[PDB]
Each structure stands twice: as C-alpha cells, then as structure tokens.
Design a protein around this ligand. Structure first.
Ligand SMILES: *C(=O)N1C[C@H](NOS(=O)(=O)O)CC[C@H]1C(N)=O
Length: 250
C-alpha cells in the first residue's frame, strides 16, 4: 500500500484515486479517507447490471435490444431501439431500468452479496422518488445502494480476473463495450463514468471506474470526486483519470 499524491491532476477538484495491480499486490492510494467512503455508484452500476441481464438471459449479446416503445426523451439517441452497446455508451436510463425490472429482487440481492458490492442495499428498489423523476430512478442512483471506490476496484478485479461465476463470454461482452480510446495505442483503458448529486451533503458523486492494461500488468482503478461544485461530472473525472494514467501509468 503506497500513499501517493495525484493532486496535480485533479486541478483543484476535491477527490481521490485508487489503482491496484493484483499480480504484485501494489496498491496506490490518493486520499485514503475518501477511497474508503461508500457512495451511490450512479451509472457505474451499469457494469454490474449488464452482467446481471446477460446471466439472466434478459439480454444476450452486445446487439441485444429492449423493445423501445416510442417514449419521447431529450437525448436524441435514447429515442430508438438501441443495442446493448449503444445503451451502455449513451447511458440510456430507460433501457437499463427496463432490463433490471425484469429481474427478481432475490436474484439481484444474491449477485450483489456474492460480489460484495458495497452495502448490497437494494431496499429502495424504485430509487430516489423525491427528486420527481419517477421511473427514471433506481436503487443505484443516489438511493439505497452505496459502494466505496476501494470496493469498486475489488469488484472490478474479481469480475475481470475471472473469479466470479459470470460466464467468460459475458465478461468479454462487457470488456468490449467498456473499451475507451485514449489516443495511446500502448495502453488499453476500459471504464464507465457516473454522475450524481448528494442532496444530503450538497456534494457531487462523480466517478470513473475501470481497468488499464499495459504490457502484462493490469491495474484496476476508481477515481472519485466529492466536490461541492455541481459542474464536476463523471466525464470531467474521466478526464482527470486519463491524465493520471498518462502521467504515472504509461
Ligand atoms: C449515471 O450516472 N447517470 C446516467 C447518465 N450518464 O451519466 S454519466 O455521463 O456520468 O455516465 C446521466 C447522469 C446519471 C443520471 N442522472 O442518471
């Protein structure tokens, strides 16, 4: 366990980072207190919900569709019968809500328990209804389910090192759709952003979680901001993570 200083890359935004190489158990941590604090995963839960849907047969391939019903949405790309790969890349809420609502709660509870997915609390299944967004809500979006950045990294490692019961075929679909292009052919980066606002603490939950492969070494990582500035989003935190990877992990 190495405590490190990545503040240069955070460019004044409050947050922390953890990178872990499980082959030589090296654990690089910036802002340990934040890295150990559980927060709503927000859209980073799509990593796990994709695997749940694949395992239960609700979806089967990166082509699979959820039967778009014509409902009007402000994001252009949500207004079509999009595939798993597009719904993941566009963070299409209706697709992933329809997906998860086809799965019984006990199956979800047992998968989260097996993964040690934070507090594994799905009690508020329908999410944070007081925000007025109705069916665009769920237990994983600023609601009952909470996970720390360290736990995210531990979950990512278990999945992608092949230590869960999920099918290898399904792991590879998720690998495929999380691949990121960082304009550096010598590292393979995979990840997913998440964005939420913690109304109780008046701080953002801005995430970028994933993994990095560079010549034999694999690093599992989670970068997290808790800034009070509402302009700090998951996409912004992904920028920060990419700066860290290029400066320290190239
Ligand atoms: C997930 O966190 N969400 C879905 C969507 N995409 O977020 S992301 O750009 O950080 O991946 C919008 C924000 C958020 C939500 N409001 O549900």
């Amino acid at each position: 366990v190495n405590i490190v200083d990545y503040s240069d890359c955070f460019e004044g935004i409050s947050g922390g980072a953890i990178f872990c190489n499980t082959k030589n158990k090296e654990y690089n941590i910036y802002n340990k207190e934040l890295i150990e604090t559980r927060r709503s995963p927000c859209s980073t839960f799509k990593i796990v919900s994709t695997l749940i849907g694949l395992e239960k047969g609700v979806i089967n391939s990166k082509e699979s569709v959820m039967g778009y019903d014509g409902t009007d949405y402000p994001n252009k790309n949500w207004n079509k019968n999009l595939s798993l790969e597009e719904a993941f890349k566009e963070s299409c809420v209706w697709y992933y809500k329809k997906l998860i609502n086809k799965v019984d709660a006990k199956s979800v509870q047992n998968i989260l328990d097996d993964l040690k997915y934070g507090n594994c609390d799905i009690s508020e299944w329908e999410g944070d209804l007081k925000n007025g967004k109705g069916h665009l809500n769920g237990f994983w979006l600023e609601s009952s389910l909470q996970i720390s950045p360290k736990e995210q990294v531990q979950t990512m490692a278990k999945i992608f090192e092949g230590d869960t019961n999920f099918k290898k075929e399904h792991i590879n679909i998720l690998r495929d759709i999380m691949a990121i292009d960082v304009n550096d052919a010598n590292i393979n980066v995979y990840g997913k952003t998440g964005t939420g606002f913690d109304e109780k603490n008046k701080r953002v939950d801005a995430w970028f979680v994933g993994m990095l492969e560079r010549e034999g070494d694999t690093y599992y990582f989670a970068i997290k901001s808790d800034d009070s500035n509402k302009e700090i989003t998951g996409p912004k935190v992904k920028e920060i993570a990419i700066n860290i990877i290029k400066k320290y992990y190239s």
